[PDB]
Amino acid sequence: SNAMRMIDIIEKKRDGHTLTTEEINFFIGGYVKGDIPDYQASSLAMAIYFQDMNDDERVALTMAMVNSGDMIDLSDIKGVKVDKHSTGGVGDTTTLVLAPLVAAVDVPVAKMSGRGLGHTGGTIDKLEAIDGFHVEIDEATFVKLVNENKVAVVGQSGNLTPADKKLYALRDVTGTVNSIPLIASSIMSKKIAAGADAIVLDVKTGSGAFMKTLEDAEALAHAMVRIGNNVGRNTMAIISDMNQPLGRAIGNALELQEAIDTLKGQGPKDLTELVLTLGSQMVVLANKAETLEEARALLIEAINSGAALEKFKTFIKNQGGDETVIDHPERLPQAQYQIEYKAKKSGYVTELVSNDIGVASMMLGAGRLTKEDDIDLAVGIVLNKKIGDKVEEGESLLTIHSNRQDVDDVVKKLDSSITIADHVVSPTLIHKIITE
Amino acid sequence: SNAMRMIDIIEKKRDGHTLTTEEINFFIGGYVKGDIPDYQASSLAMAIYFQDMNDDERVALTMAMVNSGDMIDLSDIKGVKVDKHSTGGVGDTTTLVLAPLVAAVDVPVAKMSGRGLGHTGGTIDKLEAIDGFHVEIDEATFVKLVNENKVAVVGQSGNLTPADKKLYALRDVTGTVNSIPLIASSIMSKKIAAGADAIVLDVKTGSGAFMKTLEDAEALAHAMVRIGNNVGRNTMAIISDMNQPLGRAIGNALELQEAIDTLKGQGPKDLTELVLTLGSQMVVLANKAETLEEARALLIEAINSGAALEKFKTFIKNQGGDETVIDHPERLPQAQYQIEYKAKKSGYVTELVSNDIGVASMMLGAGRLTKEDDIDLAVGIVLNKKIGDKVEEGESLLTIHSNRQDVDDVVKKLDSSITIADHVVSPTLIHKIITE
Ligand SMILES: Cc1cn([C@H]2C[C@H](O)[C@@H](CO)O2)c(=O)[nH]c1=O
Ligand SMILES: Cc1cn([C@H]2C[C@H](O)[C@@H](CO)O2)c(=O)[nH]c1=O
């Protein structure tokens, strides 16, 4: 019986034993069909939380979830399609730069993105700051664009990893999100289902990260790298710092402006370094260089020669956008009110609580609570100081870009998020580069 | 919110922390109302399975479940109402003897029993072997009978510990039955809800027991004793052997005949010793003796003088039964066919698998699979040899009492259950007597 088979699987894992591939497939298939109840799935997840899963179990779980839905076939796109996944963070504007940059060195960027919920818009929301831009292209058009220009962007497919949509939602309401085998299989399933030949992972660490400690970020990164390599989608990872927002801009059009600056070699130093580190991994994985150092050289030349920016314009143009805005980004959506937020004392910026700066930006209209909320593409925060920068009393810490006069509640959220005290060093941005 | 409060409780226990009484009450109250879903309850149960609960948590859980339903008020019955609970076992015919025996030494037996599912009938099914006997008495009648005769029996009330009915059923389908805090609170809640002033626990051990190992039986017994004493329902326990069926008779009317023999001091030695051990605890708990040895003397005198048996007759008479059957038990329901089951080789009986002998008896009609099945009160097994008894090839191991000619399938089940080999000692029946 379904009931007894699942009771036996639950007790087996509870008792510390390894599940077979067939047992894992039976669970996922049965769960996604509605044949195995949420209450048995949660019990198994909690048993997994305590007793864990080995790599073979983790791969079986990953692939069962892949096989629950759409498997996007990118085989007609020439070359090695490498995809980057970030566990997430306030100011993470890397995808905007990485797509044209990597494409500009002949690496196919077959990107599936979204809109969604969060402090700020998803990559597609940000790109829609450009008049005309859209992602309403069909399959054959996506394939053609990547073959001809090495870049294109579509939105989410309709049925990627339904077993994971269901299980993550359950994990979130039953205390079972924070378990390595469940996180690793969850993240990796979606990237594998989306068609990636190879995967680069940006695993954040620090107070603004999912994995707050370096040890936990490392554990998760290695676990995902081993899954990918085992299934034959070559995988590498970086552990990067999120003890403060990345770059300066937190918003939609504002982040697009920063991406444009970076693509001209005039962006924030942190964002530039993360881009070059992740890009270098992507270039090597795509067999467009033998070493990270060779890859980084290619990328910097692409930026310096203008090729990176020109590729961004081609990308925007090819999907309906007015690419002349890239050359004249002063014409992007501009907030009516630019309100300086000043340091209340002199010293050094020692703390910037990322998530709360994200909430502050969101409260201006930069992001959604519900799929039905509308985003204001013009609004956000631009940080004028980062951790370790000197600041004097009365100097601007950041600029608030608002389309409303009253930003009292945004200012109080920023008040809770900034600490000024005596000198500290800038935190190290790239903690670890993982190739195994 | 209900959802967030419960997520926080789940994570708290998962993380190894103690739950507050209020948190436990919120869970049980919310769960029983339908406000907290099965899938959150199961996750909490699995977290409890790994992380456990201290005594204060266990008492809060026990009492929250008590408070979910009926709390039977026995205060108008004079004296200390002591109740015995057995974790269960094939041939456990102690309640039949204990009710009249203990009553006969002036201890009030306000017994709530049932019918139910199992290898054989419940205590009420067995008593219904006597023509006329019934438990259709009201509250005031039950109270009067116990005050006047020191014994009466009713069936289950309508709504005892609904939180436990719901949680045990869930535990059984999610891998969370075998956790000490959950077992202890479950068993103790029902006994406390039923009105017992004091509780005697018969915790079985061995292959025919719930708690197969002595260490596990002990752990569970002490855990229940501490719950009871903490709530002020003085509790003691015994750990008794179930490596083979207790006594000789496994059935309904057959067990009633054995109870009658024991009440005349002519019963099986094992059943007699268990009765006297449990009875002695009950007598002391009811303040009818100062020591176990004094209690045992009282009980043996009650048997020897005829008082125990006479009390059984009064009990049966007072609830409609023909008490002359107790004096002439040869008039009880008799199976048409008595089929001897003979030893296939000489030696000593070394193994009797209790549960499978129970299944064999059940297959004759002695017990129910569903609340809708009918029991045959006449049928069952009477063992003529126990572990350590000598047997010769061709001598009767047991007698099958059947109302059908074809018992081939009962005989094959018995074949799998009996081992004859070289001499062994009878196993020790009373392993431990617990008073803390
Ligand atoms: C931890 C985790 C996150 N996610 C996604 C959804 C989250 O809202 C987002 C950031 O943690 O990434 C998963 O899909 N699965 C996971 O296991
Ligand atoms: C172990 C356990 C048993 N029981 C009852 C129902 C079982 O079918 C019976 C024998 O284990 O006792 C409980 O009510 N709660 C429990 O936790």
From Swiss-Prot, chains A, B:
Function according to Swiss-Prot or TrEMBL: Catalyzes phosphorolysis of the pyrimidine nucleosides uridine, thymidine and 2'-deoxyuridine with the formation of the corresponding pyrimidine base and ribose-1-phosphate.
Disulfide pairings: none
Cofactor(s) essential for the protein: K(+)
Cofactor note: Binds 1 K(+) ion per subunit.
Protein name per UniProt: Pyrimidine-nucleoside phosphorylase
One Gene Ontology term, aspect cellular component: cytosol
Binding site for substrate: 171, 190
Family the entry assigns: Belongs to the thymidine/pyrimidine-nucleoside phosphorylase family.
PANTHER family for this protein: THYMIDINE PHOSPHORYLASE
InterPro entries: Glycosyl_Trfase_fam3, Glycosyl_Trfase_fam3_N_dom, Glycosyl_Trfase_fam3_N_dom_sf, Nuc_phospho_transferase, PYNP-like_C_sf, PYNP_C, Pyrmidine_PPas_bac/euk, Pyrmidine_PPase_CS
Catalytic activity reported: uridine + phosphate = alpha-D-ribose 1-phosphate + uracil; thymidine + phosphate = 2-deoxy-alpha-D-ribose 1-phosphate + thymine; 2'-deoxyuridine + phosphate = 2-deoxy-alpha-D-ribose 1-phosphate + uracil
Keyword annotations from UniProtKB, A to Z: Glycosyltransferase, Metal-binding, Potassium, Transferase
GO biological process: pyrimidine nucleobase metabolic process; pyrimidine nucleoside metabolic process
